[PDB]
């Protein structure tokens, strides 16, 4: 059996700390249901991100394969920062299958893709959410040339601008073994979390993703075990 099943599997096989476990189970739990056991676990993840580091100003969230729960982690972890009084920007950096816009119920007409090429403005592309201190930069329209936008100069410089006025930036991404989008993001965003599907995963896949992220220069803060 190739599956990574727990904190011990994680430490031995990946040499990273488990920063939080989310149980299996209407999606923004930290907001909609602040009293749930699952919400507290997200606040625990925020706590462990703080112990893991220096302080975390930019965070990339990724996984080895689709469906791991990247997006759910991004959304909820971002909310725990906002409610703690930090100015927080979620960037939906998944321009292949954008999803933050559905999660927060915001319109994805302008977003990252069109911001990068300059077809929209910062004020236009960034939307304030219903959660105080939490802004959302949706993915924008799905571009033909994602790799090219991510590796661009406007992106690196937009991140720098954003980080002048946001305490923390949390960036959702496409799976690592699927496309190289996350590795490219690692140029502008050094710190990262790896989200693992506890019920369904391959030890070797997760190692490859970790190696790929480490090769792109990413500081992997730790792992989130999901659907445990
Ligand atoms: N802890 C969990 N328990 C149950 N379902 C989950 C959990 N985390 C994510 N999901 C579900 O799994 C699906 C994929 O999650 P998502 O975060 O969108 O995947 P991705 O890793 O591709 O971003 C979603 O429909 C979501 O509701
Ligand atoms: Mg997703």
Author numbering: 197 to 221, 1009 to 1036, 1039 to 1213
Sentences from the paper on this structure:
A new family of protein tyrosine-kinases harboring a P-loop type nucleotide binding-domain with a Walker A motif has been described. They have been called BY-kinases (Bacterial-tyrosine-kinases) as they are only found in bacterial genomes. BY-kinase autophosphorylation on a C-terminal tyrosine cluster, called Y-cluster is crucial in regulating polysaccharide export. In firmicutes, the situation is quite similar except that BY-kinases are split into two proteins: one corresponds to the cytoplasmic catalytic domain of proteobacterial BY-kinases (about 230 residues) and the other is a transmembrane domain homologous to the Wzz-like domain (about 230 residues) of proteobacterial BY-kinases.
